[PDB]
């Protein structure tokens, strides 16, 4: 889980946690 293309960081104002009943590709 370490590549030189992916930027390791996070945005404190948004939390990523998808709902299992919903796919993450919802518009």
């Amino acid at each position, epitope marked *: *889980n370490a*590549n*030189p*293309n992916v*930027d390791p*960081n996070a945005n404190p104002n948004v939390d990523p946690n998808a709902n299992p009943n919903v796919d*993450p*590709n919802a518009n």
Partner: antibody, heavy 118, light 106 residues
């Protein structure tokens, strides 16, 4: 904004080192790196070379290991490519590529290609 | 790293289930992307991380797979969506494309 523009090339005879330039038209080049990729007629795309900003990994492709010479240029953002001992099966269209992934999505910014014929 | 794609030809009418296989060389992580190229143009990214769909794309495409086996599937064909499809791996510093899969006609 980023809009890669490729220039420099034309009709050549067997044996020469015509220059190739990929001066950018937006932003800067202090992040990650930049690649080269070719396509010959009647074939798919293939890898050429990768250069990061300043001295870094310059890993080459499979057919051209340790034979080409590619370098950056401090300020006036550009990537310079130099080949020698040209064969005949090196006529194609060349592009300029810059890819990097972020926490918001991808960024492609596919360049434009130019024709090179022996 | 040498890759390959089996279905070098396609034969399906307007609206059909199609599958494409993207067998890999060794055990890489979930680092794979799919490119689509139409004639006389420049390639365009379709899906990255082998699962995501990327913004501004029709939902009729779907990729899946992991470990060493990766696939792609479309619900239909549509005359608008005939082109060539390439596989890419973007781990490490260098890239490596694959072979083409021409969507044949008649």
């Amino acid at each position: 904004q980023v809009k890669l523009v490729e220039s420099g090339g034309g009709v050549v005879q067997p044996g020469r080192s015509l220059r190739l330039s990929c001066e950018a038209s937006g932003f800067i080049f202090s992040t990650y790196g930049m690649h080269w990729v070719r396509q010959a007629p009647g074939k798919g795309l293939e890898w050429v070379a990768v250069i990061w900003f300043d001295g870094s990994n310059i890993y080459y492709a499979d057919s051209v290991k340790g034979r080409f010479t590619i370098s950056r240029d401090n300020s006036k953002n550009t990537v310079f490519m130099q080949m020698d001992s040209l064969r005949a099966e090196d006529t194609a269209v060349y592009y300029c590529h810059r890819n990097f992934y972020d926490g918001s999505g991808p960024f492609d910014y596919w360049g434009q290609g130019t024709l090179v014929t022996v | 790293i040498q890759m390959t794609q089996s279905p070098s030809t396609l034969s399906a009418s307007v609206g059909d289930r199609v599958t494409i296989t993207c067998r890999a060389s060794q055990f890489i992580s979930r680092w794979l992307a799919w490119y689509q190229q139409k004639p006389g143009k420049a390639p365009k990214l379709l899906i990255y991380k082998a699962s995501s769909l990327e913004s501004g794309v029709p939902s009729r495409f779907s990729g899946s797979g992991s470990e060493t086996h990766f696939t792609l599937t479309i619900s239909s064909l549509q005359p608008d969506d005939v082109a060539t499809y390439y596989c890419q791996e973007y781990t490490s510093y260098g890239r490596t494309f694959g072979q083409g899969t021409k969507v044949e006609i008649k």
